[PDB]
Amino acid sequence: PSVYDAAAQLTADVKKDLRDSWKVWGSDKKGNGVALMTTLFADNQETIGYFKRLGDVSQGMANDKLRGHSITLMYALQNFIDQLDNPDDLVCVVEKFAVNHITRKISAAEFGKINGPIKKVLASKNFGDKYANAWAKLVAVVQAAL
Amino acid sequence: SVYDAAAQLTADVKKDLRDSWKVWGSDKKGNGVALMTTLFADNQETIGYFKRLGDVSQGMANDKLRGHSITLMYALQNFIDQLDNPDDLVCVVEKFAVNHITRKISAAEFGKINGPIKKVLASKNFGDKYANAWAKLVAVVQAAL
Numbered sequence: 204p205s206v207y208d209a210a211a212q213l214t215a216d217v218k219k220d221l222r223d224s225w226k227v228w229g230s231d232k233k234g235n236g237v238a239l240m241t242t243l244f245a246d247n248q249e250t251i252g253y254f255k256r257l258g259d260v261s262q263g264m265a266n267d268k269l270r271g272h273s274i275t276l277m278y279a280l281q282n283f284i285d286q287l288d289n290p291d292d293l294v295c296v297v298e299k300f301a302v303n304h305i306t307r308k309i310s311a312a313e314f315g316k317i318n319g320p321i322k323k324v325l326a327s328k329n330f331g332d333k334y335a336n337a338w339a340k341l342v343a344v345v346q347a348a349l
Numbered sequence: 350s351v352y353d354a355a356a357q358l359t360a361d362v363k364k365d366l367r368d369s370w371k372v373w374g375s376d377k378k379g380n381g382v383a384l385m386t387t388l389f390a391d392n393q394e395t396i397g398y399f400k401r402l403g404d405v406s407q408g409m410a411n412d413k414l415r416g417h418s419i420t421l422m423y424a425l426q427n428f429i430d431q432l433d434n435p436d437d438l439v440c441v442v443e444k445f446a447v448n449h450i451t452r453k454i455s456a457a458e459f460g461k462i463n464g465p466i467k468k469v470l471a472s473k474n475f476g477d478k479y480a481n482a483w484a485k486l487v488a489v490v491q492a493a494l
């Protein structure tokens with residue numbers, strides 16, 4: 204299967220659930236981006252070494268490099284959400300960010316580690332399993348490129 | 350100083366940035382690709398840096414260029430959204446500065462984007478006042494390079 208295949212398979216219902224949840228947990232990109240990363244490092248401590256450029260990622264909001272990273276990650280997600288209705292456009296931005304991760308030797312399975320943290324941050328805003336599953340389908344579009 | 354450069358974004362400059370972005374940022378694919386092709390056409394000595402993207406003369410038809418160009422416009426979106434808070438603007442500017450330092454882009458070469466910005470804004474009826482505002486934002490990145 205192709206990335207385009209994965210992008211084309213996102214249905215109206217999945218896109219609605221992505222948009223509805225993103226309206227909330229994408230609204231505070233600094234706060235929720237840093238929370239997402241902090242949750243990744245709490246539950247997947249084996250990934251911390253990949254992020255050495257950011258310095259001490261336990262410093263959370265106080266760490267300027269972590270904050271800048273985290274905000275920018277949330278604009279990658281903003282970009283994806285805004286491209287949902289045009290698979291051509293979604294694929295080309297997914298492929299861009301996939302290259303960012305391939306050059307860091309991040310596998311499809313490793314990228315998929317983000318689903319745990321997304322599920323938790325969603326649940327902190329009372330978006331439950333249906334929303335986590337929708338986000339896993341979007342994550343899987345990136346995995347198709349990895 | 351990146352912090353001193355950020356301090357140049359006064360109330361009037363922030364307003365001009367926001368007012369012009371409401372138009373410029375409303376079509377990120379079309380306007381992003383137009384900005385890039387203007388850069389390449391008018392500054393051909395920069396094209397070599399973009400080798401990953403392949404044949405950039407293909408413009409919109411080049412998938413890698415399209416993905417790059419959309420994403421660039423979300424960097425600008427990010428900057429606009431940080432204008433309220435100099436500390437946050439600086440940390441995202443520094444992030445993107447690192448991206449350009451790895452590509453061996455200097456402050457002077459980054460500043461080559463100002464001609465293209467002036468041109469594409471003028472075509473949308475945002476003139477020198479708006480170009481100058483965007484130049485002040487570009488200068489924040491330049492200070493970090």
Ligand code: HEM
Pocket residue numbers: 250253254255256257272275276279280300303304307309313314315316317448
């Ligand atoms: C929702 C999921 C994710 C998104 C949207 C995302 C997005 C990003 C973005 C936008 C960057 C900056 C790229 C650059 O400037 O070169 C980045 C960097 C990075 N990402 Fe992710 N990422 C995600 C998940 C992950 C996961 C789960 C891992 C690892 C297991 C990972 C590892 C990395 C690494 C190592 C970097 C480089 C950090 C640095 O040195 O600047 N990413 N990511």
Ligand code: HEM
Pocket residue numbers: 303395398399400401402417420421424425445448449452454458459460461462
């Ligand atoms: C408004 C001004 C600009 C902004 C906001 C901007 C933004 C970006 C962004 C967001 C990326 C992706 C970074 C990554 O994923 O590693 C990037 C890549 C790049 N930028 Fe810029 N950029 C600007 C101007 C310039 C200029 C003027 C030059 C060169 C003279 C330049 C050279 C590059 C290069 C060579 C890449 C890497 C392309 C690739 O191989 O993927 N940038 N830029």
Ligand SMILES: [Xe]
Pocket residue numbers: 279300301345
């Ligand atoms: Xe990504």
Ligand SMILES: [Xe]
Pocket residue numbers: 283341342345
């Ligand atoms: Xe994603």
Ligand SMILES: [Xe]
Pocket residue numbers: 424445446490
């Ligand atoms: Xe930038």
Ligand SMILES: [Xe]
Pocket residue numbers: 428486487490
């Ligand atoms: Xe900029």
